[PDB]
Design a protein. Structure first.
Ligand code: FES
Lengths: 142, 80, 76, 154, 156
RNA sequence: UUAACCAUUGUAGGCCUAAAAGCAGCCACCAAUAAAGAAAGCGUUCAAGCUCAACAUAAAAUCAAAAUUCCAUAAUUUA
């Protein structure tokens, strides 16, 4: 069973959001955090990362991780830590077009998230769509 | 069911019943249920043979048989 | 992190931020292929904007078809 | 009053009886067919024309994202998984280079479209999963079986 | 027509007898339409009904018969009435292994719209202005040709 | 319209929410794909998770005729 979490690498033992949820199926909680900590060392601490753990009925761990989230980065790029209540029309930061593409190039390196598409139109739309989810407006140039 | 053998000839006149039946046999959910089964696509008139360890062997030809009848007959054998 | 408009527009601050990877500078516009900066930066292609002979047109139309059922399903 | 009730019945309209009911009617003309679906024609026409040999293997309930990865995996093999809904696949022969491949394209199965005679690359795809029924590749757009594919994939 | 022979079991599709040539009314979408039999068959016409019924009295699928839905409902009702009237001795229900019928006297009945089992007795018949009516016949067969001066009394 | 089948990946997307990931609130509302709703009813310590819509593959086509004791008997076709 594929379980996906976005928890930040900085803290490998959040508790309820990861530990018992995986435990309910029946797994070793300590093992999950240790491997997550191993990923934490390679990556910067305190940045959300998507994981694709598969909990099979055999009580096994299949941990897969990818490029750091572009949703949190766009918030960081916009200088926003906590967004507006709605964010549908509220905007606190503007992202230039040049900045948009630079991050997209690095994004196209993982084997997960479908980061192998030759055209960059797919990549930009996802981050453009992500920006719409955030309280950020993506302007061509500012 | 330790082994299930399904074959048919696309180049020659190929019966859909056996082809559709093979797809059900070669299904991830179906394979998990009969985990003991060793699946093989002998596609290359159609003859279907299923081999059991106890020695019971059922041979089915899909030329005159619909896909459902094979599924019902083979599925019943699974319970044994 | 960078907080300078000149550096922001002349250096790729967001390309890499890790400790092992240092912020790389931005090359000239001509040094990249034209398609890099020619990608669709505008709003999502609407059914009018979408070309009837493009796959995206029907793919989004199917999404719109799903929307209609969802709207009906929500009311039920 | 009794008489007043008689008037109400009289107001009932008398309808004539049709000669034949619609179900039991003689076969009448029907509205002309219209190609709605038309876009998908170009996509299949281009890919089939581009790729001479089309290896075929009934999809084993594969997920959509896996196909994206498999598309990239074949890109390593210089092949593409270009597939489209099969309802518009059947009219492909109606408006395309060939008209006689309809029986071969019976059912909804994976289409592996390759333009280059890289036999080793094609087989390697076959080596990933053999259990799914692999009909075979229409080498040079000619009907072939699974064993026939091997006999002519060379 | 596919029959299964029986472990290894093999099934053979066999040719079926064909309908008599030259239907009275060609161009008919349904066999009843083809034969001009829309309004001239009744439950007593077992010969016509038997063609569409399984050997043990089961109804055959409409798609195989090819007749339109209107006749399907009419034929099904006609067949059910014949069974309840004991007009189909060769299509009686199958005995599973060794079971035997009620082995009790069977009352002769005909023109039965519904099963006798599920019809409760009418204890209160009613007065002249409150008389209760008992349905006889089937509404599906209203369109059938009537040779009487006035339409038949469906409700007794 | 309404009968069978299936359900991938981005992003657990931003919001006071411990956490709420389609599905507590709250948002706007894009991509890839052949086909996936930035979610429709379910499940919800939160999620995993149940299906509906997705795609493929079925097959269809304007209302009727309360307490003493049931209460004529019956009855569908010869003009
Ligand atoms: S008599 Fe023609 S469809 Fe029934």
């Amino acid at each position: 069973g594929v379980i996906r979490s976005i928890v930040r690498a900085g803290q490998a033992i959040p508790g309820p959001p990861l530990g018992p949820i995986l435990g309910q199926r029946g797994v070793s909680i300590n093992q999950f955090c240790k491997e997550f900590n191993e990923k934490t060392k390679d990556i910067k601490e305190g940045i959300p990362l998507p994981t694709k753990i598969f909990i099979k009925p055999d009580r096994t761990f299949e941990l897969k991780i990818g490029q750091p989230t572009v949703s949190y980065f766009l918030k960081a790029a916009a200088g926003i830590e906590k967004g507006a209540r709605h964010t549908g029309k509220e905007v606190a930061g503007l992202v230039s077009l040049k900045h948009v593409y630079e991050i997209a190039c690095v994004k196209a390196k993982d084997d997960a998230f479908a980061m192998q598409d030759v055209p960059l139109s797919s990549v930009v739309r996802s981050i453009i769509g992500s920006a719409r989810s955030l309280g950020i407006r993506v302007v061509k140039d500012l | 069911v330790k082994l299930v053998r399904v074959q048919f000839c696309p180049f020659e006149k190929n019966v859909e019943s056996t082809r559709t039946f093979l797809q059900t046999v070669s299904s991830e959910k179906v394979r998990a249920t009969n985990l003991n089964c060793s699946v093989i696509a002998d596609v290359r008139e159609p003859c279907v043979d299923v081999l059991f360890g106890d020695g019971y062997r059922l041979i089915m030809r899909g030329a005159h048989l619909t896909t459902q009848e094979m599924l019902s007959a083979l599925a019943s054998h699974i319970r044994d | 992190v960078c907080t300078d408009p000149t550096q922001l527009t002349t250096h790729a601050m967001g390309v890499n931020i890790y400790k092992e990877g240092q912020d790389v500078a931005l090359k000239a516009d001509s040094e990249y292929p034209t398609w890099l900066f020619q990608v669709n930066l505008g709003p999502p292609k609407k059914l009018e904007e979408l070309e009837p002979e493009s796959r995206e047109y029907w793919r989004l139309l199917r999404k719109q078809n799903i929307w209609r059922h969802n709207r009906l399903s929500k009311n039920k | 009053h009794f008489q007043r009730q008689k008037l109400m019945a009289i107001t009932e309209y008398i309808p004539p009886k049709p000669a034949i009911n619609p179900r039991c009617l003689p076969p009448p003309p029907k509205p002309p067919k219209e190609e709605s679906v038309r876009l998908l024609r170009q996509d299949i026409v281009a890919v089939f024309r581009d790729n001479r040999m089309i290896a075929v293997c009934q999809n084993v309930a594969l997920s959509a994202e896996d196909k994206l990865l498999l598309r990239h995996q074949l890109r390593k093999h210089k092949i593409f998984i270009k597939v489209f809904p099969s309802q518009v696949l059947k009219p492909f022969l109606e408006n395309s280079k060939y008209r006689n491949l309809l029986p071969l394209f019976v059912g909804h199965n994976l289409l592996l479209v390759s333009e280059e005679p890289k036999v080793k690359e094609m087989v390697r795809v076959l080596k990933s999963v053999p259990f799914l029924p692999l009909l075979g590749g229409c080498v040079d757009d000619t009907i072939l079986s699974r064993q026939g594919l091997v006999d002519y994939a060379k | 027509l596919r029959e299964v022979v029986k472990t290894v079991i093999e099934g053979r599709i066999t040719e079926t007898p064909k309908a008599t040539p030259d239907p009275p009314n060609p161009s008919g979408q349904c066999p009843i339409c083809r034969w001009n039999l829309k309004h001239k068959y009744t439950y007593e016409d077992v010969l016509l009904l038997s063609q569409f019924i399984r050997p043990y009295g089961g109804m055959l699928p409409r798609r195989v018969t090819g007749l339109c839905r209107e006749e399907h409902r009419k034929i099904e009702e006609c067949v059910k009435m014949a069974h309840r009237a004991g007009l189909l001795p060769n299509h009686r229900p199958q005995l599973p292994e060794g079971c035997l019928p009620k082995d009790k006297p069977k009352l002769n009945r005909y023109l039965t719209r519904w099963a006798p089992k599920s019809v409760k007795p009418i204890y209160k018949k009613g007065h002249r202005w409150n008389k209760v009516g008992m349905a006889v016949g089937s509404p599906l067969l209203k369109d059938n040709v009537c040779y009487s001066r006035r339409p038949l009394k469906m409700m007794h």
